[PDB]
Coordinates of C-alpha atoms in Angstrom, one line a residue:
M1 CA 171.0 64.0 106.8
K2 CA 167.2 64.6 107.2
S3 CA 165.3 63.7 110.3
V4 CA 161.9 63.8 111.9
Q5 CA 161.6 66.4 114.8
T6 CA 160.3 65.4 118.2
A7 CA 159.1 67.0 121.4
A8 CA 158.5 65.3 124.7
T9 CA 156.8 65.9 128.1
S10 CA 156.3 63.8 131.2
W11 CA 154.4 63.9 134.5
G12 CA 154.1 62.0 137.8
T13 CA 156.2 59.3 139.1
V14 CA 155.2 56.4 136.9
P15 CA 155.8 58.4 134.7
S16 CA 153.4 59.2 131.9
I17 CA 155.4 60.4 128.8
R18 CA 154.1 61.8 125.5
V19 CA 156.4 62.1 122.5
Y20 CA 155.2 64.1 119.5
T21 CA 156.8 63.6 116.1
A22 CA 156.6 66.0 113.1
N23 CA 157.2 63.9 110.0
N24 CA 156.7 65.3 106.5
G25 CA 153.9 67.6 107.4
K26 CA 152.1 65.5 110.0
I27 CA 152.4 65.5 113.8
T28 CA 151.6 62.2 115.7
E29 CA 151.8 61.1 119.3
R30 CA 153.3 58.1 121.2
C31 CA 152.4 57.5 124.8
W32 CA 153.8 55.7 127.8
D33 CA 151.8 55.1 131.0
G34 CA 154.2 52.5 132.5
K35 CA 153.1 49.5 130.5
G36 CA 154.1 49.8 126.8
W37 CA 154.1 52.5 124.1
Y38 CA 150.9 53.1 122.3
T39 CA 149.7 55.6 119.7
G40 CA 147.9 58.6 121.1
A41 CA 144.8 60.5 119.9
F42 CA 146.7 63.6 118.8
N43 CA 147.0 63.9 115.0
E44 CA 147.3 67.4 113.5
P45 CA 149.2 69.0 110.6
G46 CA 152.5 70.5 111.2
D47 CA 156.2 70.6 110.3
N48 CA 157.5 71.6 113.8
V49 CA 156.2 70.7 117.3
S50 CA 156.9 71.8 120.8
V51 CA 155.0 70.8 124.0
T52 CA 154.6 71.7 127.6
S53 CA 152.4 70.3 130.3
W54 CA 151.4 70.9 134.0
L55 CA 149.4 69.3 136.7
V56 CA 146.6 70.8 138.7
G57 CA 146.2 68.3 141.5
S58 CA 146.2 65.0 139.7
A59 CA 144.9 66.3 136.4
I60 CA 147.3 66.8 133.5
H61 CA 147.0 69.6 131.0
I62 CA 149.0 69.5 127.8
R63 CA 149.7 72.2 125.2
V64 CA 151.2 71.3 121.8
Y65 CA 152.4 74.0 119.5
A66 CA 152.2 72.9 115.9
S67 CA 153.7 75.1 113.2
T68 CA 153.2 75.2 109.4
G69 CA 155.0 78.0 107.7
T70 CA 154.7 81.1 110.0
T71 CA 151.4 79.9 111.6
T72 CA 151.6 78.2 115.0
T73 CA 148.4 76.5 116.2
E74 CA 148.1 75.6 119.9
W75 CA 146.3 72.3 120.7
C76 CA 145.0 71.7 124.2
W77 CA 144.5 68.6 126.3
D78 CA 142.6 69.1 129.5
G79 CA 141.4 65.6 130.2
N80 CA 138.8 64.9 127.6
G81 CA 140.1 65.5 124.0
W82 CA 142.2 67.9 122.0
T83 CA 140.8 71.4 121.2
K84 CA 142.3 74.4 119.5
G85 CA 143.7 77.0 121.9
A86 CA 143.7 80.8 122.0
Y87 CA 147.4 81.2 121.1
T88 CA 148.2 83.6 118.4
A89 CA 151.5 85.2 117.2
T90 CA 152.4 87.6 114.4
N91 CA 155.2 85.7 112.5

């Protein structure tokens, strides 16, 4: 059976949770901050997704690795929007 592919990260004690879903070439984001799931700003092409995040003090930083074919693009959240990161790999 086919299925979408997800990746998840969380932080703090509430917690905040972010769940990324790769579905038929598109990666979208659902978010929890303690009071209901909502659709996040992240929307980028990809058939596979992984994620990691870390705090610096109270500030969250998220890195999402979105892959199409042999190309993995890193997307970066550092508090004010998603930008493309420096990640490269020779796949």
